[PDB]
Amino acid sequence: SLFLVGERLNATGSKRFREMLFARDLEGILALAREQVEEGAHALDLSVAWTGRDELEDLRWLLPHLATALTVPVMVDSTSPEAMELALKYLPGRVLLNSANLEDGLERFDRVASLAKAHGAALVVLAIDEKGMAKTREEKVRVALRMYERLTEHHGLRPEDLLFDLLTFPITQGDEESRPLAKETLLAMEELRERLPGVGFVLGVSNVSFGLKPRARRVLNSVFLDEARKRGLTAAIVDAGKILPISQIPEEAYALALDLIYDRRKEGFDPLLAFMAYFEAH
Numbered sequence: 684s685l686f687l688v689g690e691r692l693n694a695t696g697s698k699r700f701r702e703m704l705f706a707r708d709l710e711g712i713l714a715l716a717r718e719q720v721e722e723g724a725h726a727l728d729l730s731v732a733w734t735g736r737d738e739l740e741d742l743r744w745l746l747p748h749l750a751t752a753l754t755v756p757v758m759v760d761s762t763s764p765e766a767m768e769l770a771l772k773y774l775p776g777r778v779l780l781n782s783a784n785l786e787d788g789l790e791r792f793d794r795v796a797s798l799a800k801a802h803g804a805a806l807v808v809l810a811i812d813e814k815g816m817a818k819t820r821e822e823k824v825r826v827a828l829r830m831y832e833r834l835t836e837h838h839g840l841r842p843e844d845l846l847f848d849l850l851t852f853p854i855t856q857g858d859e860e861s862r863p864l865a866k867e868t869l870l871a872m873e874e875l876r877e878r879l880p881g882v883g884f885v886l887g888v889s890n891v892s893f894g895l896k897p898r899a900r901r902v903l904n905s906v907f908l909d910e911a912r913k914r915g916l917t918a919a920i921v922d923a924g925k926i927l928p929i930s931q932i933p934e935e936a937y938a939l940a941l942d943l944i945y946d947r948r949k950e951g952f953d954p955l956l957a958f959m960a961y962f963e964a965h
């Protein structure tokens with residue numbers, strides 16, 4: 684069953700965490716960590732990056748305290764290799780590195796992958812290369828295979844140490860480009876689960892619903908998570924306490940969520956509006 688990675692220790696993603704980080708309210712941060720663990724998280728995503736603030740200084744402060752206080756591994760969420768090195772130095776045993784990609788070329792990808800190999804950390808890899816983010820199922824497969832080959836041949840990373848992130852886009856804007864983006868990821872995951880036995884798959888599930896009302900988001904996140912699980916998802920970055928069991932979602936909301944995820948437009952039926960309409964009326 685799913686390896687849940689709590690999303691909330693995230694300075695851009697959480698006002699609560701950011702204010703505590705800025706005030707050096709360690710006990711506040713530790714309580715938020717424990718909340719998420721109690722609510723189901725088996726690891727904690729940690730993203731302190733905040734524009735015009737020193738990521739390395741924040742991590743030098745917070746990481747030693749997390750190492751002694753936490754019962755679960757930390758997924759270090761950063762694009763700075765120095766920040767990843769801080770995390771690897773301070774944290775015990777399993778760390779997960781989120782993430783490596785190919786946008787900056789092979790050498791940056793290798794630099795991050797080398798860190799994972801050398802310190803026995805799991806590695807998240809994003810479906811992003813020099814041409815940008817893989818949005819269609821074909822693009823996602825192409826990038827993932829190129830990465831898989833580099834990571835196994837060359838770095839000697841094991842399939843089970845890899846978490847492929849095939850990208851979660853918001854399907855709430857309603858433009859043509861974004862409507863199929865959750866489906867493309869779902870279809871790619873199923874295909875790659877077959878092509879690449881033993882690898883993990885991770886998604887930042889909450890991104891799918893950005894812009895909807897909170898109740899609508901919880902439903903959509905929960906349905907998207909469940910659909911991804913059926914396609915082979917092994918880990919999820921989620922607000923662990925806000926994931927609904929499918930059976931708790933009312934019938935019409937559930938059906939509309941599926942219509943939105945799979946872009947099941949017909950004449951006179953826009954799944955996005957119908958989904959939004961539901962939560963206006965209930």
Ligand SMILES: CN1c2c(nc(N)[nH]c2=O)NC[C@@H]1CNc1ccc(C(=O)N[C@@H](CCC(=O)O)C(=O)O)cc1
Nearest residue numbers: 690693696697698760781807848851886887889890920
């Ligand atoms: C793009 N994301 C992502 C990733 N890492 C990977 N591998 N993949 C991903 O898709 N790291 C960051 C984010 C996943 N984490 C998060 C964290 C918070 C929210 C979020 O929606 N936060 C609320 C605010 C909550 C509050 O302040 O009360 C928001 O509306 O911004 C979303 C995604």
Ligand code: NA
Nearest residue numbers: 694695696730
């Ligand atoms: Na962030």
